[PDB]
Design a protein around this ligand. Structure first.
Ligand code: K
Ligand code: MG
Ligand code: MG
Ligand code: MG
Ligand code: MG
Ligand code: MG
Ligand code: MG
Ligand code: MG
Ligand code: MG
Ligand code: MG
Ligand code: MG
Ligand code: MG
Ligand code: MG
Ligand code: MG
Ligand code: MG
Ligand code: MG
Ligand code: MG
Ligand code: MG
Ligand code: MG
Ligand code: MG
Ligand code: MG
Ligand code: MG
Ligand code: MG
Ligand code: MG
Ligand code: MG
Ligand code: MG
Ligand code: MG
Ligand code: MG
Ligand code: MG
Ligand code: MG
Ligand code: MG
Lengths: 93, 132, 208
RNA sequence: GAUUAACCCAAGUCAAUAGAAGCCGGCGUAAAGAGUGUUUUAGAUCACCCCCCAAUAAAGCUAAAACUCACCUGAGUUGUAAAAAACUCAGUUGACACAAAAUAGACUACGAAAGUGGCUUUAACAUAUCUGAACACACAAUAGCUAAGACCCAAACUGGGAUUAGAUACCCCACUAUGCUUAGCCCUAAACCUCAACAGUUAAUCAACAAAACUGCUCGCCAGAACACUACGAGCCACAGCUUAAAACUCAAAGGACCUGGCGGUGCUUCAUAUCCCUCUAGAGGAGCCUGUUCUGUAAUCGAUAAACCCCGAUCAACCUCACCACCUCUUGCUCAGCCUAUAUACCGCCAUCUUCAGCAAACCCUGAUGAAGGCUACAAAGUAAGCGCAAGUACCCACGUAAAGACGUUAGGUCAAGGUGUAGCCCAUGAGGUGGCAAGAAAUGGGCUACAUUUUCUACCCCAGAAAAACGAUAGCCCUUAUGAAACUUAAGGGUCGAAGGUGGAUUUAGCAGUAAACUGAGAGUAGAGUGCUUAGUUGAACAGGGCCCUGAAGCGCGUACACACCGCCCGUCACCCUCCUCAGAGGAGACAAGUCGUAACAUGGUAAGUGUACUGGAAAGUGCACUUGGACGAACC
């Protein structure tokens, strides 16, 4: 299932943590998490939000961050690491 | 809303004349033309010259008879004679009326190179067609 | 409408105006006396007392019209009628005397019967109960039925499937098919009826 | 702030602080009648005058419907707005509870209150005077804890299925604590009829609303809001609890009831007449082109920019127009200067807008206790109204229709660049003049023209024809000529050259009710020339016009309202943003200040009605379960 989230570049840390926990729940549930981030802010600054969100789950980018909405927003897709990918993570760990 | 030469209604304490009481669309239906000349007919010439002359005449008479005109002037043109029929208020002295009539007639005759007559009609106070 | 409400539509029937005065009921005599003192519109340029006048064909020509080209539309209609009659005459002559009894050659009759066959009995109308519209089957008035028949015929003719085929031939062929209860128009009517029957379960959604 | 003047007191004035004025007022909604009942001490004069229905405890019983089990029959059952999930259990008949008690009840009784509505029986419903507990005793729905049983059904939490941006909810399924019985605890409710007990009156009423106003007596309670159903102290079988309950910091309000307006994912009724939906016709949304705009670019205007902008100011830009940019030049300057410099949120002027409306109304009168406010009923009940608008009248071809007209106001709606104009600003320049130059397309989007053809295309003709038909299809591009002009690759027309995209177009959307839509043909405005634009004359000339109310809306009558900058409103909570105070070993709590982050919990039926108590759960408001309240409604003859 596709679970979608919409965020702002000026989202507070408490809201960000809450939505991070929600995304973790979805990933554990094995859902595709489509995250969109909208706006001054740089697109790299926005993509840092994706870095942090996936940092909290050392989940993987099924689709990498991409500019959308006329380039105003970024969008990405996260997925639960397959069994083989998780085994690779364990080995590298 | 249309504002063209319309006297907007008020508390009923605003006197107005027959000319002012009627919006533009009534022209030729309830009120005639304040200037009569052939310039605007089919195929005639010098419409602009006639109009400029009319405008200057109106401004000139207004400034020459300050606070004396009661209603708008009536310009008429017959051949080359120009006739300004005006309605004024019985306040200024008749001596000054006669002086200004002579002066206006002479100056306008010389300025527009055509005989000019001024026909004054004196009234006690501005005719109040209605109160708006 | 330049005509004031007082004006009434003219009636064009020589038989009606020549009906004997004795045959008139009280109400009919009253109607005539009232019309004696009523305002009547001018006779429209589309109809006349011509014995050959056909209102159905007049309406069909009007529906076929494109951009006020009454001349072209009427020309197409007469060409269609002539083509139908010629086809029927050819079939009649080429056919045996036994089946010549059934072979019909009146183009007007063929046209009327084809339209009547194509008329769809039950339509699908949107009906809204509780805020949601559904395509409920519903009876149709005769006016709507005739109009739908004519419109389906004309649209089928206008389709681009028949390329480089003149409208007279297209319409004559389709009219003959409909008369013999075949062809895309009859297929469409049956499809509408089939959809209505499939949606029969929603009939109660109607309130009128 | 300075200055001028004025005012008050005056050898004083008045900044700060302190004090002086503190109870016979109230308790339905503003704080206040404490959840209920009974004393002693006392108080009062209201003391002598003067059967039954649904209380409660115990014991017993069961009609309907469940569950389970038996039969046999079937492959489906449950689930809703639609589904998924869930079970192979489903139907008939029969047997069968420690669960809950249709109809009666349209009754209004019992009890002190909580509560009590299946049946029978036993016991039983205190006081011949009324008040009387934070000062004790006995009770106190639902929830909840303790220990043991029952468990049909329902059900917090939990799990699953949906829905969702998310869904810790609303919807569906399963199941647990729990609801039940026993013995203890707990002692809280919007425990509200928010209206204390007793006795009495209906007379001169009475802020508002609500359930009319009061008198006497008594007890309890109240004294701005919030901090605060809080901290501390105290008591308690209570251990995240209950009762009592402050203070500090902070504010000038908080609050109760109404009137008007707006608003309602507000109710009923009736409508929309090219109109909101279906229905008819023709279109746009798909291709090219013309053109406007937004963006990009440039040294290179400005204004409109939701309806009500977008072939708009312009009935028009090669120079000019021109207000733009670059450079150069002039300074009492065409002007008793000048400024297209800012302010349409100072204006006049002319307008859009509802308005495809019909109301606006001065001056009076009355009603409300003489409050904001309101003013209708025709078998008429407080309205009368001058004037404005509609209407009438008028142009066009009728008395039809189209025009015109369309008030008060709404959007601080447009225009300081038509012109003027207040204020502010420039004056060796933000003024004036001269030369040159920009005005393009990455690309999106609006309107129109051309087409996609066979009802077509070319030719003749203006309607009895002949050919074409993969060709149809540019007004696009390139080359040439011509018209105007001083200047033409860039403006227009004609010709040649090329025959391009395209094959009737998605959701969505425009216009039209008849000589209209549609198609076609002219003319005019403005220019030297210039539009597929604009105005307008004319030809041919249609189909539907019948149903409805989801949405748009309109009206009427109502309902609610925490909104009044009027829902684009208000407002809650978390998180982090700084100070004051309090509790605290540092951390919490409150308040204030104050812009954010995530939602939209509350105010409208606030989109799941709101809330009280209690329990579990959750970023967060909050969700759900049980009972209780209306401080919600159910549209108030029958339908
Ligand atoms: K199109
Ligand atoms: Mg107008
Ligand atoms: Mg209160
Ligand atoms: Mg007592
Ligand atoms: Mg007590
Ligand atoms: Mg209890
Ligand atoms: Mg249980
Ligand atoms: Mg109660
Ligand atoms: Mg409490
Ligand atoms: Mg406490
Ligand atoms: Mg304590
Ligand atoms: Mg329409
Ligand atoms: Mg397009
Ligand atoms: Mg502009
Ligand atoms: Mg602008
Ligand atoms: Mg120049
Ligand atoms: Mg220029
Ligand atoms: Mg300038
Ligand atoms: Mg304005
Ligand atoms: Mg009128
Ligand atoms: Mg008009
Ligand atoms: Mg404005
Ligand atoms: Mg503006
Ligand atoms: Mg300048
Ligand atoms: Mg060409
Ligand atoms: Mg030349
Ligand atoms: Mg060709
Ligand atoms: Mg809500
Ligand atoms: Mg709600
Ligand atoms: Mg609740
Ligand atoms: Mg829950």
């Amino acid at each position: 299932l596709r679970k979608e989230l919409i965020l702002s570049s000026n989202i507070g840390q408490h809201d960000l943590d809450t939505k991070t926990k929600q995304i973790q729940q979805w990933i554990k549930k094995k859902h595709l998490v489509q995250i969109t981030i909208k706006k001054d802010v740089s697109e790299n600054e926005m993509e840092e939000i994706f870095h942090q969100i996936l940092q909290t789950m050392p989940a993987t980018f099924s689709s990498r961050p991409q500019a959308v909405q006329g380039g105003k927003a970024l969008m990405c897709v996260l997925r639960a690491l397959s069994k083989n990918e998780e085994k690779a993570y364990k080995e590298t760990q | 809303k249309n504002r063209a030469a319309r006297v907007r209604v008020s508390k009923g304490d605003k006197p107005v004349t027959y000319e002012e009481a009627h919006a533009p669309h009534y022209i030729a239906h309830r009120k005639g033309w304040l200037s009569l000349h052939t310039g605007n007919l089919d195929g005639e010439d010098h419409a602009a010259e006639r109009t400029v002359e009319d405008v200057f005449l109106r401004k000139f008479m207004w400034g020459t008879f300050p606070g004396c005109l009661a209603d708008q002037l009536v310009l008429k043109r017959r051949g080359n004679q120009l006739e300004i029929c005006a309605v004024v208020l019985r306040q200024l002295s008749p001596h000054k009326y006669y002086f200004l009539v002579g002066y206006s007639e002479t100056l306008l005759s010389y300025f527009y190179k055509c005989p000019v007559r001024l026909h004054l009609q004196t009234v006690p106070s501005k005719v109040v067609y209605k109160y708006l | 409408s330049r005509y004031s409400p007082e004006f009434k539509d003219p009636l064009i029937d020589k038989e009606y105006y020549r009906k004997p005065v004795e045959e008139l009921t009280e109400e009919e005599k009253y109607v005539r006396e009232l019309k004696k003192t009523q305002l009547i519109k001018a006779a429209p340029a589309g109809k006349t007392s011509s014995v050959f006048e056909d209102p159905v064909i007049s309406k069909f020509t009007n529906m076929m019209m494109i951009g006020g080209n009454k001349v072209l539309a009427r020309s197409l209609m007469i060409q269609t009628l002539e083509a139908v009659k010629r086809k029927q005459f050819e079939k009649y002559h080429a056919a045996s005397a036994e089946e010549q009894a059934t072979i019909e050659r009146n183009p007007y009759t063929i046209f009327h019967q084809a339209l009547k066959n194509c008329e769809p009995m039950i339509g699908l109308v949107p009906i809204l109960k509780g805020g949601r519209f559904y395509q409920v089957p519903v009876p149709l008035p005769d006016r709507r039925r005739r109009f739908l028949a004519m419109k389906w015929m004309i649209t089928e003719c206008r389709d681009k499937k028949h390329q480089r085929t003149l409208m007279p031939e297209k319409l004559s062929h389709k009219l003959l098919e409909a008369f013999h209860n075949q062809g895309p128009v009859i297929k469409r009517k049956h499809d509408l009826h089939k959809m209505a029957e499939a949606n029969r379960a929603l009939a109660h959604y109607r309130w009128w």
